[PDB]
Design a binder for these strands. Structure first.
Lengths: 335, 35, 165, 101, 132, 223, 359
RNA sequence: AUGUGGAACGGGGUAUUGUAAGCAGCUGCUGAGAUUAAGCCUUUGUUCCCAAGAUUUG
RNA sequence: AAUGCCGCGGAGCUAUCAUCUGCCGGAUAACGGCUGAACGCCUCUAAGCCAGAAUCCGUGCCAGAAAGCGACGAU
RNA sequence: GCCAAGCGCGACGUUGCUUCGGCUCUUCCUAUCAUACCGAAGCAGAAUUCGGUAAGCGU
RNA sequence: CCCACUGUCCCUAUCUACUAUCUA
RNA sequence: GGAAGUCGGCAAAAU
């Protein structure tokens, strides 16, 4: 058999990979976030210069397989205050935003269509009527609670996914005093937080998610897993047309490979490219978290400058990055 | 070879936290924070 | 290097700065070390320290005392070589016996000429089985005389006997 | 970074893609895919193989000296590359129209 | 040897007859054991390009046969992926008859030489004819 | 004669190539070897720490003289651009597509006369004559096709294998129009070119080269 | 002999404890009466065999470590005999070999006797009997271990002389300046003391001259030290460097030194002899002022001739980040005219075409 | 439980195979034709469907 | 034509035949010490205190009490 | 046998002489082969030898 | 014994039918 | 790769 630290080998009790540990809080650092939620689209292979001192491929180039995760900006819909107790952390109270998008309202219902859409109705009414209760609760969190987690949901509509329920979750707000975290959450109420503001493509992060099920084996598969030290290679912007165009390559193109991502679609929003494989198949939600413990060796610290990113047809033996140059080489078709 | 729980290795990890780490990561968080 | 090279190094460079003090501290604290040792250790090594320390006290007490006066069917036992119904192993059989003279007090390895009588059994005497208390004749020309076996050859592994003289 | 041309299909071969094969004569064959690698293996002549560029070339159907770096030269080369490709595309379209006629 | 060597696809296990590429007169080389193998249960030791193993001269001159002595693999039949991403496979499995110090016993080498093997062993690169 | 060893190898000629106008050192290894080379020739001729074909065998792979240099066809486009940028404009750099890419191990060339391998291509010989501007002779050294690896050639002298005949050594010396000595370097290492590199005014030998070998090289090169 | 490479020789008591502890720790030590008689016999036999193997292995290692006097070089054998009584050492080695043979014979006899064991007590008694006999034999061979250990310490401390190569033997009157000349010529620093025979043992030092390696060997002033010096000079392809006190500042008269040289001429025959007139300021005759330290180099060169006739980027990298952590940039070391162009990157391939290869 | 809704087809993209039937004098129409979700992508294309039954729940 | 035979063959599965990743704190043993009595000296030990092993206990990772629990939304 | 603190024995010392049998597998013990750390040794360095803690991890 | 051959093995992987399973 | 498997070319493919 395998390692005894992973048994009992049973199905994960959650579709979305839940964070089990957040980086330790620091008052010296100002107020920011630590985790983000994305959707796996697939991976390609890229050619990257190797600036690895002491290595035998120093000042050379290697080919690396890199997973692409679409990460549309996340909407902060609430905040949760946690108070330390002799029996552990306890959720003291929760404050939600006044207006919640249908994407996050669909989470509370198994049948949103048959529902009367009554979620947060009186909550929105009391929010508009009197703000003294909201002020009392926020003052309660900043005075008593020691850990602050913002409720954020993903804009699943932008992703080419048939699912319309947003994966609501909590992001621990590490940095500054408790009042600073509360002020940060209130300012960011109803707004959007971007992965460009959270991660910046040169740090060492961990990816967590549920693996894909292999059926029945002599149970094997569909288990919660935590990959450590997955390096971000590029946080590409969806709007920019140079997202998949490096400086050594030009050739204006998009990260979505020609022919589309297999069983996922076309990536149009901000995407994240991580070195190596990540758990879960395509179209499954993955969670990203910062480094709990600081460890930047040369591999985790060296800068990265991509040279060429493959966008060939992953469906089948693709042999052309873009239909433009495909038509330039291939003879003119009958159509 | 020594394992990852080597007491000296933990000591050297602590020493290198304030040498090739820490400060360059704190301001790195600050930059995307003010963003 | 050549010959006593640290003796050259000690001469031209000197000794360790605190060696004399450390050796003094080690000697001074040895009494606490030994007492601690006598209580913590267990098992074979403890029993060795027990026997070694008991011996050291005995000699030390004597040295002080010397100070003041100055101021199947087979034979299962070792034997010597129808009537031979049983089987006598060749390895078990012995031909030379270490006989210690009484008056002389010297052990001499003499050949086993024969077995006089085995008090355990006449058949053992007939079979020539070397056992405790058995009388055996050995050559005494270099010193034939009889002798009684005062040991157990089956266990000691040697035919150790004392001369009947 | 050189995007090579396959021996058999004569198409563009990119890093990671295809297979590389070295002969005892120290001659190197690059294959754009397994199909073209296999097609070399039983030794089909590209010019007889219908979908190869060599067939489409010979059937009527269609710098070793280093240069010092110069920003102006690189910009001029990049600008001229698009125009050259556009001219080639127009010539190919006219050739296709002539072939159809 | 000199320098590190990357993980490589293993395709020359024990009990393998393998071509001799040097001019010493040997024709066939017989793999007996692989240097630097781990304690892996029921795993046959294997060799790859640039790896030096114990080999015996099966066909050659009488004096080089019957000696369990090192040989470096220079060509490999099984396809391997180099870290640059390209895949290489050679027609045959060629080897060079080498002393345990790492010096070419022969004076000339026939056939192409793997670039990793020329890089790993400086003497092999010195006596190599072509390294492609 | 300077004693140096790249990494833990005495075959300095494998990891580096020396000419009368420029020097090349391996990339990705230890900077000590490059510093040692720069300490003796950095202020005289340029030294480029580059690699050919992604390997540290550039010394035995690249062959050339003070006028021009040749690199194997396996050299990358970026590598060729880096070499041209580092090397002076008067130092011509040309790529050679030959069946034997080991130019340094097949051909030994001086500033005036060059000896190539017997099986060199006519196009390669024409390119060598055009670039190096030297007379190319198709011969062999000590009966071995690897003339560039078994023989060391320079402007003031040459070194060959000690097993060569006296008449053969005299014929080679007359053909090369320079003195020739049949000896060994690095304590019997028969690959003189791999074990030692000699320029017009200086020579570099491995750390394992004997005192007698160093004295013989100094007498032959008159340095 | 001079190769040393011999492990330390423990005392008799320490060796016995080491052997017994090794047998106890390695062999199993749990044998109950419930096991079969064959199992009990096998357990006792295994313990006896393991003890016999351990004793035999240690004895064999001790025997093999000591070099054979006959197989050593004549100079090495003579020095060993003069310094450590080679006859006694050979006797001790023979006694140890005989003891090892007796131990093996005793173990074989005990193993055969225990093969037909009867019960647990008989096996236990037999197992004890074999161990005690082995311990008695080990304890009996007590003084031999101490003598061997002292010889090993002396042999390890002894120099590794190389008479085969060119050598220069400096022998003569004590403190005649030959030792000072040898110390100056060679890297070795031989101690010099006012007391006679300060250099009790020979000192060998390598030197380089005219691209040749010369082994300068000093000898005690001319006793055991004198006998060792004579033995070394008797069989050694070396040039004599006898020094005579010209000023008689060494306590030996010129006539006495000449008489000693004439007497020792039989050993100096068939060799290049040098007569060093020491303390000149205070057989080839060379004047070397011992007090003024003048002419020592000339004398050494003359003796060598007679013997021959008879026969930075790295600093910047270390300061910046150190080796293996500092990324060397080749962009700076470029001959591009524009510094901005050299530091800036260019597109290698674009739109399916290699821009670098098409520009 | 009426929507960037769903499903049936269809178009386009993309892929696999290797130039289709048929016509004319091996060549041309023909890298055409066929297949393409059955666990590929996309759809201002066409048609159809749904604003329900039963159960349980303070 | 029971999948007659042959070549290629997506998709899927799969391969140390392909690729990624594999963590930090203290407390100790052996042992080395500091202060320091017992015992007017001394002493790593008695009260005390450091340094110190791949050991130990945590962190991290997996499971979540299906009779442990909190906050929140609607009614 | 000689002593022999002592209580005729008499310890430590001293004299002699010489059917079973083995593959896989699971864990477990340490009486530790390797890995980690210490102590000692004429232990210069390197390579060792002996002895401790030590079953985490292999064998 | 030599040569050839092969999933016996390194080291297993994939496909097909039947079985196996559930329903009346 | 080619019997390295197993006490062993047992079964397959080769012919």
């Amino acid at each position: 058999h395998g390692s005894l630290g992973f048994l009992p080998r049973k199905r994960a009790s959650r579709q979305r990979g839940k964070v089990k540990a957040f980086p330790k809080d620091d008052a010296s650092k100002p107020v920011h976030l630590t985790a983000f939620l994305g959707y796996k689209a697939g991976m390609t292979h890229i050619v990257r210069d190797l600036d690895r001192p002491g290595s035998k491929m120093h000042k050379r180039e290697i080919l690396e397989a890199v997973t692409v995760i679409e990460t549309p900006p996340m909407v902060v819909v609430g905040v949760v205050g946690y108070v330390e107790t002799p029996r552990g952390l306890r959720s003291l109270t929760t404050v939600w935003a006044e207006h919640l998008s249908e994407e996050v309202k669909r989470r509370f219902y198994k049948n949103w269509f048959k529902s009367k859409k009554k979620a947060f109705t009186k909550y929105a009414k009391k929010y508009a009527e009197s703000t003294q209760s909201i002020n009392r609760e926020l003052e309660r969190i900043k005075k008593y609670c020691s850990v602050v987690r913002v409720l954020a949901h993903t804009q699943i509509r932008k992703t080419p996914l048939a699912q319309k329920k947003a994966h609501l979750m909590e992001i621990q707000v590490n940095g500054g005093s408790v009042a600073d975290k509360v002020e940060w959450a209130r300012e960011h109420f109803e707004k959007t937080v971007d992965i460009k503001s959270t991660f910046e493509q040169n740090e060492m992060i961990d990816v967590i998610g549920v693996t894909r099920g292999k059926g029945n084996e002599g149970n094997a598969g569909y288990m919660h897993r935590t990959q450590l030290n997955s390096k971000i290679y590029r946080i590409g912007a969806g709007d920019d047309a140079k997202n998949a165009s490096t400086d050594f390559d030009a050739t204006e193109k998009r990260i979505t490979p020609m022919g589309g991502f297999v069983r996922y679609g076309v990536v149009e929003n901000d995407f994240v490219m991580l070195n190596g494989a990540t758990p879960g198949p395509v179209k499954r939600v993955l969670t990203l978290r910062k480094s709990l413990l600081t460890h930047t060796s040369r591999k985790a610290l060296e800068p990265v400058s991509l040279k060429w990113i493959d966008t060939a047809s992953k469906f089948g033996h693709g042999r052309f990055q873009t239909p433009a140059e495909a038509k330039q080489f291939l003879g003119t078709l009958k159509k | 070879t020594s394992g990852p729980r080597d007491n000296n290795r933990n000591k050297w990890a602590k020493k290198h936290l304030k040498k090739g780490k820490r400060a360059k990561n704190s301001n790195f968080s600050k930059f995307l924070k003010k963003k | 290097p050549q010959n006593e090279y640290i003796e050259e190094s000690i001469r031209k460079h000197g000794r360790r700065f605190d060696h004399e003090e450390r050796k003094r501290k080690k000697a001074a604290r040895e009494a606490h070390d030994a007492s601690l040792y006598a209580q913590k250790t267990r098992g074979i090594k403890a029993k060795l320290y027990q026997e070694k320390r008991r011996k050291e006290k005995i000699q030390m007490k004597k040295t002080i005392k010397q100070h003041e006066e100055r101021n199947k069917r087979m034979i299962t036992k070792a034997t010597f070589v129808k009537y031979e119904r049983f089987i006598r192993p060749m390895a078990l059989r012995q031909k030379k016996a270490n006989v210690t003279h009484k008056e002389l007090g010297v052990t001499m390895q003499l050949p086993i000429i024969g077995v006089k009588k085995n008090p355990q059994s006449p058949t053992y005497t007939q079979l020539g089985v070397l056992t405790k208390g058995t009388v055996i004749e050995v050559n005494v020309s270099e010193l034939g005389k009889y002798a009684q076996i005062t040991n157990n050859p089956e266990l000691d592994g040697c035919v150790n006997a004392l001369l009947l003289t | 970074m050189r995007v090579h041309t396959c021996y058999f299909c004569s198409g563009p071969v990119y890093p990671g893609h295809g297979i590389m094969f070295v002969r005892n004569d120290s001659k190197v064959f690059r294959f754009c895919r397994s199909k073209c690698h296999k097609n070399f293996k039983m030794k089909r002549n590209p010019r007889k193989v219908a979908w190869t560029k060599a067939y489409r070339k010979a059937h009527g159907k269609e710098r070793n000296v280093p240069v010092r770096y110069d920003r102006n030269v690189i910009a001029t080369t990049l600008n001229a590359m698009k125009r050259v490709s556009q001219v080639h595309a127009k010539r190919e379209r006219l050739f296709y129209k002539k072939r159809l006629a | 040897a000199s320098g590190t060597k990357y993980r490589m696809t293993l395709g020359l296990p024990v009990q393998a007859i393998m071509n001799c590429a040097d001019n010493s007169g040997a024709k066939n080389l017989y793999i007996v054991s692989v240097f630097g193998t781990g304690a892996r249960l029921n795993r046959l030791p294997a060799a790859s390009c640039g790896d030096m193993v114990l080999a015996t001269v099966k066909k050659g001159k009488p004096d080089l046969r019957k000696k369990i002595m090192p040989a470096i693999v220079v060509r490999q039949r099984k396809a391997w992926r180099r870290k640059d991403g390209v895949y290489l496979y050679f027609e045959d499995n060629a080897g060079v008859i080498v002393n345990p110090k790492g010096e070419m016993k022969g004076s000339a080498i026939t056939g192409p030489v793997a670039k990793e093997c020329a890089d790993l062993w400086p003497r092999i690169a010195s006596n190599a004819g072509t390294v492609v | 004669a300077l004693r140096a060893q790249f990494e833990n190898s005495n075959e300095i000629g494998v990891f580096s190539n020396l000419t009368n106008s420029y020097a090349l050192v391996a990339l990705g290894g230890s900077e000590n070897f490059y510093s040692v080379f720069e300490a003796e020739l950095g202020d005289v001729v340029p030294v480029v720490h580059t690699t050919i074909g992604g390997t540290r065998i550039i010394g035995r792979l690249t062959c050339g003289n003070r006028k021009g240099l040749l690199v194997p066809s396996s050299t990358t486009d970026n590598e060729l651009q880096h070499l041209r940028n580092s090397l002076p404009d008067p130092v011509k750099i040309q790529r050679v597509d030959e069946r034997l890419s080991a130019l340094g191990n097949i051909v030994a060339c001086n500033d005036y006369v060059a000896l190539v391998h017997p099986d060199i291509e006519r196009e390669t010989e024409e390119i060598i004559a055009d670039v190096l501007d030297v007379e190319v002779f198709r011969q062999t050294v000590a009966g071995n096709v690897l003339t560039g690896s078994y023989c060391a050639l320079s402007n003031q002298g040459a070194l060959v294998h000690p097993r060569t005949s006296i008449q053969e050594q005299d014929e080679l010396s007359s053909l090369l129009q320079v003195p020739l000595v049949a000896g060994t370097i690095n304590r019997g290492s028969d690959v003189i070119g791999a074990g030692l590199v000699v320029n017009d005014w200086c020579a570099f030998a491995g750390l394992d080269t004997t005192a007698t070998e160093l004295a013989v090289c100094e007498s032959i090169f008159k340095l | 002999a001079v190769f040393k490479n011999i492990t330390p020789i423990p005392d008799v008591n320490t060796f016995l404890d080491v052997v017994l502890s090794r047998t106890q720790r390695k062999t199993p030590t749990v044998i109950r009466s419930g096991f079969k008689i064959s199992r009990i016999r096998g357990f006792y036999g295994r313990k006896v065999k393991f003890t016999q193997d351990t004793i035999t292995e240690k004895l064999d290692s001790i025997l093999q470590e000591f070099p054979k006097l006959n197989d050593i070089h004549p100079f090495h054998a003579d020095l060993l005999n003069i310094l450590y009584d080679r006859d006694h050492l050979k006797i001790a080695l023979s006694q140890l070999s005989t003891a090892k043979h007796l131990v093996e014979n005793v173990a074989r006899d005990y193993i055969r006797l225990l093969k037909y064991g009867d019960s647990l007590y008989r096996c236990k008694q037999l197992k004890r009997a074999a161990l005690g006999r082995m311990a008695t034999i080990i304890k009996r061979q007590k003084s031999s271990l101490e003598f061997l250990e002292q010889v090993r310490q002396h042999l390890s401390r002894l120099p590794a002389i190389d008479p085969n190569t060119r050598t220069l033997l400096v022998c003569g009157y004590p403190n005649v300046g030959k030792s000072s000349f040898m110390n100056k010529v060679t890297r070795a620093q031989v101690d010099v003391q006012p007391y006679a025979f300060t250099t009790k043992s020979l000192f060998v030092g390598h030197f380089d001259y005219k691209y040749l390696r010369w082994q300068v060997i000093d000898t005690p002033g001319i006793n055991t030290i004198e006998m060792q010096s004579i033995t070394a000079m008797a069989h050694l392809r070396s040039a004599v460097l006898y020094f005579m006190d010209l000023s008689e500042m060494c306590g030996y008269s010129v006539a006495a030194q000449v008489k000693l040289y004439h007497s020792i001429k039989p050993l100096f025959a068939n060799k290049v002899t040098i007569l060093v007139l020491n303390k000149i300021d205070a057989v080839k005759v060379v004047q070397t002022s011992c007090v003024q330290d003048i002419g020592v180099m000339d004398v050494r060169t003359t003796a060598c001739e007679a013997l021959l006739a008879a026969r930075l980027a790295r600093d910047i990298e270390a300061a910046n980040g150190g080796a293996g952590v500092y990324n060397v940039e080749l962009r700076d070391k470029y001959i591009l005219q524009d510094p901005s162009w050299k530091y800036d990157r260019m597109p290698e391939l674009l739109d399916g075409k290699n821009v670098a290869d098409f520009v």
